[PDB]
Design an enzyme around this catalytic site. Structure first.
Site, PDB file in Angstrom:
ATOM      1  CB  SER A   1     124.702 -31.433  23.122  1.00 39.46           C
ATOM      2  OG  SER A   1     123.294 -31.581  23.182  1.00 39.46           O
TER       3      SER A   1
ATOM      4  CG  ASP B   1     124.046 -30.836  18.878  1.00 35.26           C
ATOM      5  OD1 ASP B   1     125.222 -30.865  19.298  1.00 35.26           O
ATOM      6  OD2 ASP B   1     123.121 -31.478  19.417  1.00 35.26           O
TER       7      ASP B   1
END
Lengths: 341, 342, 342, 342
Positions: free
Chosen positions: B51, B185
């Site tokens: 991320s 993600d």
């Protein structure tokens, strides 16, 4: 040699797991000419997750796979009612959780009981769950590790209810003894095979003081949820009601997660085994049902056609794999030893 | 030898703590070692990330300095998470769209890293953790440092950065035109990429380290002040019968619980393996538990000046204290690392 | 020989966490060590405490068991902190009144310890921290255990318990009719009474224990989940120039920050002294930090069902793991403590 | 080994007594020992302080004579606490804003020491006590006399002086840009820095004093004539209706009580330790309360002419008498302590 049985979480697709186990029991009983056999006696550690964890607890408690399959068959339509599978909508799921905890609670009670605890078990078993009350994953295991003996007074049914409590498909399971709420174990490990080998190598070192990956064989039975994905038609909308169907009401997120952790655990296990140059140890029995797509895989579809398809897939896979595969037979050659706390 | 790994966890805004700590480490390195034009990314063979940690790892691999990254990320973190969208969460809006949009984050990644730089141009090995929503498998965007796995050569760094930073509910799934796939993600599978980084070093980087062993591996896991997360006990007590709205908060609690649980699991396995190897000193992790009134404030949503100030101060203090106390942090930067040749 | 000191902090329902931990410890000794009718307070030569920790300390020193105190405290703490008084805090209500009445706490302490017991009838040494508002100097209630200082001989235990728990704003200052002096919470000076316990044993215990040295001293500081507490970053960033309302949100914020400061300072001195004497194993602290959520709700005076459930579960879990893995905890209860003769 | 420490105990406006006493001691040194250009800073190896005591400690550590500091005090004390704001404490104004602005105190510190000198520029050791509101921990600004703790090298003296004297309800918390944190008064956690100074000399100031013991350490703790503060009994009695506003006067009474109790506890512990080691003659606390003030009327921000002249006369008389009769001050003030090197 150490044998590990790890069962993934598939919901209704756990019918495939239980049918494969029951058919393997029957095949052993006929071909090997055994009497009153139990398939849970051929594994030194029976891990699991979600309904796979429920089946693992059932096998560890001494229940055979045939009575387990019968209980699954009768309770499948009550755990996952048609009225709940249909008529989901955004408004209903925004105010409550689809499906009730009482039906599968009764199913687990008929499966293993209500007063059985981890201390009375004669087989090692390690379930996986996410402790919502702290955030750290909780691994319900028998006191096979002298340091890890904080689950002796916890009932098996509580662990089974906790590990099968899918985030959206059910409600978090409250354990009275620990005063904590728990979620599904598929959020951490939908394939408990790798963590099973890790536990074998690091935790139960007292029983086996020279355990090595070369002496560890894993029989991972899936639920044909591995090849799950979000269909491109609903993926490439991201607009209005299309977005509402992108993440659905939580189920899309949960299913994509559980599939991703299952893939990652299996993938890293495969890389580790190839690095150790031992690929025969990991034995997996999986397939893909025809006429069903990647996104057609639903965790709570209890239609008669889906049940029949799972039954047929389990039967044919068990028969064919025992006919052709040799590692499965070597798994079901020698019975394991009682844990004897 | 000595293989060094930079692990950068994912915390969205909470990556400001990591970038501030890295910039402060660079500054004190220059001050105490009397060096010049130093880069914190030149002492690491592999730079793992997830991320915002993955975006920082890509920026460090692309040759950018930690201080330039820190300033650009300050401006871009102010821009990415508007107060207008942060306050206006509710549930009617959240049912029709994600909380934020990917365009400010795309501009952020473009400004911090670039738009045309691809994985082949990089001279430093770097990981990107992501989940493929089209095939259902986790995709690990890596440099072409292994001949067998080279599919990321024609993929821009910005594409991988947007893939790893696209949280399920916070952002829409980023679309890669080259691969015709959608990505989510990487924290869904690995919010702490230290374990997968060690595994990759052991198995996927033996070309440059034929006799690489876990014993001589150095890991620097710079956390994002999010080691521990929990679900509100009163919410669990009262609303554990109501899905999504309450007990899940539009799936934000689902995503956060998955991230926290899998990060805890991976960290636990890493620690147990290192302890079994009797090499626990090989793992250096920087992280603090945020106190009572600030923990309920600093999340992966807020670009408020107070949260940024707290993150920057925590980063500076942690960097100074760990550099003064821990010797292993010194040996991490005692020598540089040779850039890898494709 | 060996000297053991039990020190408890003060956090309100975190006192319920502390008493839950002590009760589970008692149960663990009862099961594993095969002992019948075991009280957790029989294994300490001095039992110190502060606020709710002080109340528990007095209860244990009076001869009660940890389980009895836990069972009383659950219901009496649901009673002490009504959801009503919690809900309407506002600013005018707190400007004209304290948050809670002291009568429910009065009946609670009466249920736990009693109303006729005094410091002279105790068999185990106890120290209690308090602040004398009338004279300014801190007041340390204690059973004499020292011929030169027996001032508190005729003072009831319940009066001291009410005085030490009288938070500056959460409660009203307790008025001891015998001394004609008002008293406040002991956490204003010592939230963690471990260093003061060390000093008291090294000074007051010179007759009972002539050869008193820090190396033969063991401390079991059962914390109350209040190790860290920092003011919210948004308030500091925005309303640092404002008055009582926003910044320093009444005695809540002021006293919480004060007690956190003293707790950290005293633990810092204790740890530095033990490092200097190289006896760092002699201090055993059982505490943990609360995550992002469960932080705004696990507070000083939050006696909600979910909060109580979470505190009870945390106490049970911490008790289990800390007894399992720590040798010092088991070494604490190997032998009982000789009762002191007044 | 004759280590000497100069500890100053808070006081706010009442630091005029301490500065006047130190200036008069300088004058008597010059008039009796026939020395010229005498500074009081170099007779002390370490100069601790807190609040305005910390400000004076920093001024003396910078190398300024006590007379210049005394004159700057005589001006800036009446320039800091206006009569307009003192007579307008009121209750809604203090609920909205703080009593005093920080600009007059900032200008006072700038005129005293400056605005650019940092802790590394100092030649005399000094500890400055404060509480970090951003992290909820006590922060101790100090010169880099210990290689392990050197994070204060690039911190301006004026910033530390502002931070240590930022009373909770009197001044707004000081925001230091270098550390990006907000700080409060040091009197909350340590209003009598004598004990922490002795601890620093014992276990922190060991690089230049490897052979250090409490018997060869001397402390000149100059008070600020506020050691007998207490809550007026009528205010204690009237804590039910409109009189309850008087008690805990918007936190002012809370902070005053905390500072008084903290300084009493530190002095009490230091006296205990010295009497146990039979070195009580090493502690020279030079203070004596004025005979024309009620013990309960000991304020912190009284800048009226009568209070200022009372403090001046008390300081001069105390210095004269104590240098006349007390041989301990004479033994203190014989030789110049050698400066330390970073």
């Amino acid at each position: 040699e150490i044998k590990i049985l790890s069962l993934n979480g598939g919901g209704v697709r756990g019918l495939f797991t239980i049918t494969l186990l029951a058919e393997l029991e029957s095949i052993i009983e006929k071909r090997e000419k055994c009497e009153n056999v139990k398939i849970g006696d051929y594994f030194d550690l029976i891990t699991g997750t979600s309904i796979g964890g429920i089946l693992a607890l059932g096998l560890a408690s001494g229940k055979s796979a045939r009575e387990l399959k019968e209980a699954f068959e009768i309770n499948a339509t009550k755990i996952f009612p048609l009225k709940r599978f249909k008529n989901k909508q955004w408004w209903n799921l925004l105010r409550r959780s689809i499906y009730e905890s009482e039906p599968l609670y009764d199913a687990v009670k008929s499966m293993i009981g209500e007063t059985i605890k981890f201390e009375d078990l004669n087989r090692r078993v390690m379930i996986t769950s996410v402790n919502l009350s702290t955030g750290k994953p909780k691994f319900f295991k028998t006191p096979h590790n002298p340091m890890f003996t904080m689950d002796r007074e916890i009932r098996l049914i509580d662990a089974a209810m906790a590990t099968s409590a899918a985030p959206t498909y059910f409600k978090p399971h409250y354990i009275e003894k620990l005063e904590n709420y728990f979620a599904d174990g598929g959020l951490v490990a939908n394939n408990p095979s790798y963590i099973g080998i890790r536990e074998v190598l690091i935790d139960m070192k007292n029983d086996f003081p020279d355990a090595k990956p070369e002496n560890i064989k894993v029989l991972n039975i899936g639920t044909l949820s591995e090849d799950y994905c979000i269909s491109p038609e609903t993926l490439s909308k991201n607009s209005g009601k299309g977005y509402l169907s992108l993440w659905n009401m939580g189920e899309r997120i949960v299913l994509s997660t559980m599939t991703a952790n299952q893939h990652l655990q299996r993938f890293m296990l495969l890389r580790e085994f190839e690095a150790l140059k031992i690929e025969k140890n990991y034995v997996e029995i999986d397939e893909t049902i025809p006429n069903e797509a990647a996104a057609e895989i639903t965790l709570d579809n209890a239609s008669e056609g889906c049940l029949k398809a799972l039954r047929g897939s389990g039967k044919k896979l068990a028969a064919e794999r025992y006919t052709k595969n040799e590692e499965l037979r070597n798994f079901f050659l020698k019975k394991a030893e009682p844990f004897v706390p």
